[PDB]
Amino acid sequence: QWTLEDFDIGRPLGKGKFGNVYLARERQSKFILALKVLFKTQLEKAGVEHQLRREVEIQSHLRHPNILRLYGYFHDATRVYLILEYAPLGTVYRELQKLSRFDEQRTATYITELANALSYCHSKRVIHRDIKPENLLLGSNGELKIADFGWSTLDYLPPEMIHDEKVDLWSLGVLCYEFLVGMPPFEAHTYQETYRRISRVEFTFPDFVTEGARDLISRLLKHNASQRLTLAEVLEHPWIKANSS
Ligand SMILES: CCCCNC(=O)c1cccc(NC(=O)CCCCCNc2ncnc3[nH]cnc23)c1
């Protein structure tokens, strides 16, 4: 039975779609966490109030080092509060912008962590949609954490979304490419060109992308969703094996 006065509120972490997220301390435990505040009126205007309840119910049963932990949740009358794990090292997107690109070791390790988290949920009959780098947070140990509401931008959508269990495989291909190159593979100057690139699966590798990486990405980025390299096969990939930590 959590209440708002059980928490001391610190700095805002960022503005979002339905509200704000803050650094916070639970008063009894002195534990550092993130409190996500979502306004009910905005959820009602979008018509996602029931969707959020079902989402939060799923996440409350998910316990994996590479999925952001939901410790609990509560409401008052106008706001919905989510008690979330705090990630001290920020987003993977920000890390990518700072370095411009990741090396093979970091890329393979992130993909392994993603595949592990998605495989864990698969055994619990839980599926994920598209994955964005801004929704991947980094813990103190340098481990990636999936932090979104996709448990059940055009640049990250598969051809079928422009769909069921195989969306996340396309996402892994896009992310692996972006981690190594610094930009998503279907990046274009217009919406129409970006749409065409995705639908026709038209992407190219710069010269610095190694053959092992190219093989992994090409097996992932297929129009035929059922023929995409699966989570088990990704973890078993020669390039992943050789480069993951
Ligand atoms: C899909 C729609 C629902 C909602 N999400 C939101 O409305 C929403 C509300 C507030 C913020 C955001 N996201 C953002 O503003 C993304 C920017 C990143 C902020 C840093 N966030 C965190 N840094 C470290 N540890 C954490 N644990 C949980 N979050 C964090 C999103």
Q: Are 208 and 182 in contact (CB under 8 A)?
A: no
| CB contact at 8 A, 177 and 184 | yes
Q: Is the CB of 19 under 6 A from ligand 1?
A: yes
What is the C-alpha separation between 184 and 19, in angstroms, rounded?
28
Nearest one of 92, 138, 145 to 114, comparing CA atoms: 145
129: left (phi over 0), alpha (psi -120 to 50) or beta: beta
Resolution to 1 decimal, in Å? 2.0
C-alpha 160 – ligand 1 centre gap (Å): 27
Which two structure tokens, joined as six digits, stand for 106?
A: 């970091």
Torsional sign, CA 7, 136, 111, 95: negative
Count CB neighbours of 189 within 10 A. Answer: 7
Asked if 153 and 130 touch (Cβ cutoff 8 Å), the reply is: no
Using alpha carbons, select from 40, 53, 44, 42 the residue that is nearest to residue 80: 40
d(CA 67, CA 121): 10
Which residue in the list 6, 8, 76, 130 is annotated as catalytic? 130
CA angle 17/184/166 to nearest 5° reads 75
Instruction: Tell me if 89 sits within 8 A of 110, measured CB to CB.
Output: no
Distance between CA atoms of 244 and 144, rounded to whole angstroms?
13
What are the structure tokens assigned to 179, written together? 């981690």
22, 34 contact by CB (below 8 A): yes
Contact criterion met (CB below 8 Å) for 71 and 59: no
Say how far apart CA 242 and CA 227 lie, in whole Å.
24
Angle at 234 between CA 143 and CA 168, to 5 degrees: 75
Give dist(CA 137, CA 144) in Å, integer: 6
Q: 35 with 5: CB under 8 angstroms?
A: no
CA pseudo-torsion sign 221, 227, 230, 233 = negative
Does 145 carry a binding-site annotation?
no
Q: Please, what sign has the CA dihedral across residues 117, 121, 122, 127?
A: negative
Query: Distance between CA atoms of 173 and 170, rounded to whole angstroms?
Result: 5
| Beta pairing partners, 24 | 9, 33
Closest Cα to atom 1 of ligand 1: 149
Does residue 11's CB lie within 6 angstroms of at least one atom of ligand 1? Answer: no
CA distance 194 to 150: 23
Which pair of structure tokens corresponds to residue 58? 């799923």
Q: Say which amino acid occupies 172.
A: L
Q: How many CB atoms lie within 10 A of CB 26?
A: 17
Instruction: Using the Cα atoms of residue 172, residue 36, residue 15 and residue 24 in order, give the sign of their dihedral.
Output: negative
* Dist CA 60 CA 70 (whole Å): 6
Q: Which helix (H) or strand (E) holds 19?
A: strand 19-26
Does the annotation mark 130 as catalytic?
Answer: yes
Q: Which residues pair with 33 in a beta bridge?
A: 24
Residues 6+ apart with CB under 8 A from 9: 22, 23, 24, 35
Sequential DSSP letters for 180-207: HHSS-TT--SSHHHHHHHHHTT-----T
Rg (CA), the chain: 19
Of all protein residues, the one whose alpha carbon is nearest to atom 19 of ligand 1 is: 14
Does the annotation place 17 within a ligand binding site?
Answer: yes
Q: What determination technique applies here?
A: X-ray
In angstroms, the CA 174 to CA 133 distance is: 10
- Number of residues assigned to the chain: 245
| One-letter identity of residue 20 | N
d(CA 35, CA 11): 11
Task: Give yes or no for a contact between 138 and 92, defined as CB atoms under 8 angstroms apart.
Answer: yes
Regarding the beta carbon of 84 and ligand 1, being less than 6 Å apart is answered: yes
Cα torsion angle, 31, 36, 37, 43, sign: negative
Expressed in angstroms and rounded, the spacing between residue 92 Cα and the centre of ligand 1 is 13
Domains and CATH numbers, the chain: 2-90 (3.30.200.20), 91-244 (1.10.510.10)
